[PDB]
């Protein structure tokens, strides 16, 4: 159940474990593959890389034990402290990650889309086709330009996109859905 912390990601070298993670949540990415399908997983023998949010989630659940470079176990709270040190808004972002994951959604990097997350029902490829999730940071308002920008990030003709935030008062995760209105 082991993965190794190497900087800001965790790498799973036990291929049989790697395969189980990927076929059971589409956790991680195999180097250097992508859009790996479940049914080609068994013929893949490469390490799996997990992002820090993924690794923390799996550690919490506990489907992963993370080992550091000095051979220490890295507990969940240690992983979180690292994220908080290095990544602005880690705690709020993790909450969002966990929100979607706890409800059964596949959550992946949003970098390629210019967004926080890409969120899938079945899996990236294939098919259908990410919900683009944009983060609203603390202390930040919203304006018209944010809204059209999200519409641009969308891969739907309806220009649909989601804004995720955590309300400071309550800690509530709040998701808003937007889409173009042809009135």
């Amino acid at each position: 159940m082991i993965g190794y912390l190497r900087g800001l990601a965790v790498i799973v070298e036990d291929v049989e474990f790697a395969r189980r993670l990927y076929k059971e949540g589409f956790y991680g990415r195999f180097l250097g593959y992508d859009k790996v399908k479940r049914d080609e997983v068994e013929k893949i023998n490469a390490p799996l890389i997990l992002g820090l949010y993924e690794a923390l989630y799996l550690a919490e659940k506990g489907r992963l034990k993370v080992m550091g470079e000095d051979g220490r176990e890295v507990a969940p709270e240690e992983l979180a402290a690292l994220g908080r040190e290095r990544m602005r808004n880690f705690d709020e972002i993790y909450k969002i990650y966990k929100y979607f994951r706890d409800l059964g959604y596949v959550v992946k990097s949003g970098l390629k889309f210019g967004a926080l997350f890409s969120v899938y029902e079945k899996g990236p490829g294939i098919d259908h086709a990410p919900m683009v999730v944009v983060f609203l940071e603390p202390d930040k308002g919203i304006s018209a330009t944010d809204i059209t920008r999200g519409g641009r990030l969308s891969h739907s003709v309806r220009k649909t996109w989601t804004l995720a935030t955590v309300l400071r008062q309550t800690g509530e995760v709040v998701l808003l859905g937007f889409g173009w209105a042809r009135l």
């Binding site: 059964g104 304006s143 018209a144 809204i147 209105a181 009135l183």
Partner: protein, 93 residues
């Protein structure tokens, strides 16, 4: 009074909306087959998340979909639906 907001009224009126009520600066109800709650957002004019959430909540209360009417700095109008999502469990989990 406000030429940018006016561009929204003109636009909606041109396509058969009736303006039902103005609730506030920036907030009004209008109707074409169903009543909607409109919130005008002018380019460059930021609002807090709390304000947006409140408008969205007003929609739910009044049983009306919320529409953001986005207005460019020189009067072009574009409309987005908005809603607070209640995300169900993934069926394909």
């Amino acid at each position: 009074m406000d030429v940018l907001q006016e561009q929204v009224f003109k636009d909606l009126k041109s396509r058969g909306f009736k303006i039902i009520e103005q609730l506030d600066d920036k907030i009004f109800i209008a109707e074409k087959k169903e009543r909607y709650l409109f919130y005008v957002m002018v380019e460059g004019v930021e609002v807090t998340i709390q304000t947006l959430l409140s408008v969205i909540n007003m929609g739910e209360t009044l049983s009306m979909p919320v529409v953001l009417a986005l207005v460019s700095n020189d009067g072009t109008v574009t409309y987005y639906y908005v809603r607070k999502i209640r995300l169900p469990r993934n069926i394909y989990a």
